[PDB]
Amino acid sequence: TQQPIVTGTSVISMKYDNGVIIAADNLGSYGSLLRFNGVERLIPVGDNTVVGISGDISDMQHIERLLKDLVTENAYDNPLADAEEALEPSYIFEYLATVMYQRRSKMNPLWNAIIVAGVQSNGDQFLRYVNLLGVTYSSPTLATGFGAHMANPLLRKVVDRESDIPKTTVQVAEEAIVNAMRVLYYRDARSSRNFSLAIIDKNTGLTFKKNLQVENMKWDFAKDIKGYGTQK
Template sequence: MSLSLQNGGAPTRALPSVTTVHATSGGNQRTTRPITTGTSVLGIKYKGGVMLAADTLVSYGSLAKYKNARRLVTVNSRTLIGASGEYSDLQSISDLLVSNALEDRCTADSLYDEDNNEECAGEVWSYLRAVMYQRRNKMNPLWNDVVVAGFRQEPDGTTTDTPFLGVVDKIGTAYEDDVLATGFGAYIALPLMREKYRPDMEEGEARALLEDCLRILFYRDCRALNRVQIAKVTKEGGALVSEPYELDTYWDFKGYVTNKGEIGTDGGW
């Protein structure tokens, strides 16, 4: 077979005239890094339920691009998830879980809601662990840390009084705890939550603790926002997610207003 010179002078073997090569069609595409990302998700067990909290900011690099992105999602009437990391991957996970729930409903033996057993939080957590690990093995991970909240389930499908709180990361590492935090919150908020946590906390105490941690993250994390959401799961009331609201902030701390270096500057270094 003879050699031919194409544009640019690179010697290549001549291809048959019937063969067409498309440069954009070859190879599999991979997400090599997250692009639009959300930061911390906090979770805590309290007396009678589980509560999650997150802000509504999704950043494009260092740009605070989307300020009303909701990262707390209701899976079914007794399970919640919240995720930090790539927002489009969270949407993909949410669509996957909703699709599974619809398939379970369509293939159920009964058309009545009270006869259908929804997936409990433990089942959703175990399923996500398998999904994350499978995607990691394909070298195409979902770039999220996902917190799952809800209640455990008996073999007959009845909901127990035992709350569940677990997390799965992008490579399939999974664990449970009484308090959890992802993103920058794992460094700043989690020690505060562990210090203040009690198993018999009331709902108001748990919410106040989460709001305090979100406020501190807003002060210290440049990818955080004071516009937040709170979500909870209780055995009687099911899964509920609040509308976004803004936290009160305080910027008159001495360290914020004192000129650095005492040289009469504007406070910068």
């Protein structure tokens, strides 16, 4: 059958003019117990593509196995496949897609949602989504899970359509993603203060910034509230 057991939280993301930002937090909850802390869900693949995975921890580990084999596979034969036929983001995507569909048909699904975040060799941005139903789509703002209706609204207020990707710079995007982790962190009851962040640029390569904390929280207001309504 397969149904979720141990589950992550959310991986959230948006496009900007010269690359894409994607960030995810470090959590494996086993329902009520938040049992694995410091187990990372962003997986850098290639050298320009970060593939951020939500849902099952079990399943996710076994799809990291296949990505690593895929770098080994593309390297074989050809020495020019690490220079101009490298693993593109659209490549890493296509294989992840196709695997989901085929597993859906036998009625034992690999229960994950993936964002495949990168930039092409042509310099185009690539942020594309797949889930366990097998559904694909691209958007300028993308988010897995709970974050697809929590974090996604805030992110999507910076980039609304495909003509505000040029106008959104690396510093406004940086801010928006920070902000959306904090918005999640308040109202989502499976979250962790630690989160990993990747920034994909089209001139400075992939930078993998680990082990950020969320700060600048609000709680200062909470001394004022007393009772539920009858008590004052």
